[PDB]
Design an enzyme around this catalytic site. Sequence first.
Site, short mmCIF file in Angstrom:
data_model
loop_
_atom_site.label_atom_id
_atom_site.label_comp_id
_atom_site.label_asym_id
_atom_site.label_seq_id
_atom_site.Cartn_x
_atom_site.Cartn_y
_atom_site.Cartn_z
N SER A 24 0.68 -1.20 0.00
CA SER A 24 -0.09 0.06 0.08
C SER A 24 0.80 1.12 0.24
O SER A 24 0.24 2.51 0.25
CB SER A 24 -1.03 -0.10 1.21
OG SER A 24 -1.72 -0.97 1.23
N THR A 27 6.44 1.30 2.34
CA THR A 27 7.83 1.47 2.48
C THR A 27 8.15 2.84 1.72
O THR A 27 9.23 3.75 2.23
CB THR A 27 8.72 0.36 1.59
OG1 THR A 27 8.02 -0.87 2.08
CG2 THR A 27 10.24 0.58 1.80
N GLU A 44 11.62 -2.67 8.45
CA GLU A 44 10.41 -3.29 9.19
C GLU A 44 11.12 -4.52 10.29
O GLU A 44 11.88 -5.07 9.95
CB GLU A 44 9.74 -4.42 8.05
CG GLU A 44 8.95 -3.53 7.00
CD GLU A 44 8.27 -4.72 6.14
OE1 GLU A 44 8.61 -5.74 5.91
OE2 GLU A 44 7.26 -3.93 5.50
N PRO A 237 12.59 7.05 -7.93
CA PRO A 237 11.85 8.19 -7.42
C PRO A 237 10.45 8.00 -7.59
O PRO A 237 10.10 7.06 -8.24
CB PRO A 237 12.22 9.29 -8.38
CG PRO A 237 12.74 8.84 -9.66
CD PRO A 237 13.60 7.43 -8.96
#
Lengths: 297, 300, 9, 9
Positions: A24, A27, A44, A237
């Site tokens: 989603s 990160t 994580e 990016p």
Amino acid sequence: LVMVVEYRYGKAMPLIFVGGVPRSGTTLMRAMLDAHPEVRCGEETRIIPRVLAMRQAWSKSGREKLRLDEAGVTDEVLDAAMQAFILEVIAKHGEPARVLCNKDPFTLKSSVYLSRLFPNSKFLLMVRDGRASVHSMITRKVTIAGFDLSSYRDCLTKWNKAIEVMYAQCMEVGKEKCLPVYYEQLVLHPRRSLKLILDFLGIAWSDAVLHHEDLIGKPGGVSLSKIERSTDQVIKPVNLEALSKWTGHIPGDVVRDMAQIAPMLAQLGYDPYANPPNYGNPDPFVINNTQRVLKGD
Amino acid sequence: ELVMVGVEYRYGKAMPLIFVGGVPRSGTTLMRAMLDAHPEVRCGEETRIIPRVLAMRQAWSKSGREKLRLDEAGVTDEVLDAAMQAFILEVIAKHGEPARVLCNKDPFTLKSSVYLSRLFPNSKFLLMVRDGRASVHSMITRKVTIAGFDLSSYRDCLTKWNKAIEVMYAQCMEVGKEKCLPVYYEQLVLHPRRSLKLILDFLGIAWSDAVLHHEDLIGKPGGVSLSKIERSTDQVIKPVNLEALSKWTGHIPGDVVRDMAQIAPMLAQLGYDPYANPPNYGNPDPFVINNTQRVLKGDY
Amino acid sequence: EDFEDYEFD
Amino acid sequence: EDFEDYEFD
Ligand SMILES: Nc1ncnc2c1ncn2[C@@H]1O[C@H](COP(=O)(O)O)[C@@H](OP(=O)(O)O)[C@H]1O
Ligand SMILES: Nc1ncnc2c1ncn2[C@@H]1O[C@H](COP(=O)(O)O)[C@@H](OP(=O)(O)O)[C@H]1O
């Protein structure tokens, strides 16, 4: 108390929890926060979600809770233990910084609890079209215990219940403490989005959040696990490629039953019958970024 | 160093902790009750959550792949251990009253005594040991459930008692004489004075007579907190008595009696003769005899 | 649901 | 396959 200007870590410290259903944009979000010289999220931890699930278990189960109470292992004690475990993991697993942050996708199932434990923490909940999140987990084979990757219907059904919970928790925590961040809005308008987020966080602007990929491997910058599944995407990016790759890959029966399988879609503003929704118009910034990614920069 | 009032007691990773354990139904609740009765010491009830977190952390280091991902996330051994240290210590310190010396009793924690020893370098261990035929008879007739044990079978339960204590005893040996002391349940029951003298020495706690009077301190300030739903409670409210040493004899199926040596080679290794059915555990101190007569008289 | 007197051994 | 990429509940 000391992480190691000398920042000390503790229950009252400012803290940022990022999360949401995996695939989603979680990160990406934390890498953009990592880029800010005053923020560190890092990788994580994996174990924080486990101890929370444990905690959430010993609550529902009556027989178990009764046994813990009668042993003097009360909420007060459990919460103190949880607090200390979490503080230690968050504080010690990366470099120090004025504002500490954690991204582990499912932590956001317990934002109400986490907010109670850390009364100055805030929460960024990532929201992305469930159809995109699910198609991502199926095609890339990112495994979540209890999601059946052989079934769009199943994964959609469990995306739905997952985000229903996380959203409700976000609402209860209140708008001063939890901000839903729409992946597709973040990609479409990075600068507008990051402006609102940092504001909400009470942290000051820095152009660095718009250049996260230049800070990969660098100090005070963005640290990536090479095993994490999102890593190959976060090196690029902010770009437009992943918005609607899902379109056309949904079985026709799931297309029919979309609103029933995923009522959260319409709740969060995704038309469950647009294939795909029109997410908005891309900023020139992400148009250009996208163009560099296709050539291979 | 976290602090509690109730002077003010200061607790940290380097404090002297007592960890009691062993295979359940081995006199572990009795042992920690006797220590809770020392005014300087609080053990308190079974926390349950400590062996649970220990299992979890165990899984994570057991998988090579999971270890790799943790390392790559900066979640290294040092970070895990610090989080464990902190987690375990909050639960121990705060689940009951504060006290100079802190103690925990969760029976299987002792499968992890090398680890706990590493985490808490001045903590010591009391491994309760009891004739497994006694513990197995106990777990079976009382229906005390232990994950993986089949209570319909003595052969299965003794086979697993055997494995549990083989591991626990290997750990005890590995931390050594200065840090882990095996305590025989039957010697404890027959000879409580001498037992507790030797136990308190080993722990470097000054003698106190109240260790021999745990039953007068139940529910009392600085005394013995009992959970009413732990299976040992109805037994531990009485003074150290003799009734339970040998009552297992004759309630073991003949085939298991016969195979006792294949089934539980840890009996011999620990000094219980597997063909003695029962062994002579020895002779009681007048103190224990009197305690037992008081029990029969019905003063509890 | 899988409640036992001792759950981890 | 001792742990998945994710877990909770
Ligand atoms: N630089 C970038 N620009 C746009 N989206 C990105 C990105 N880096 C990562 N993402 C998206 O974030 C998703 C993963 O989110 P999470 O970190 O929660 O798993 C991936 O979706 P896809 O697998 O559909 O590409 C990924 O493409
Ligand atoms: N006051 C006492 N005197 C002698 N033995 C005792 C006792 N209180 C408890 N025990 C023994 O400790 C055993 C339970 O150990 P644990 O607490 O490790 O489960 C029980 O064995 P039985 O069930 O054979 O009676 C119990 O009788």
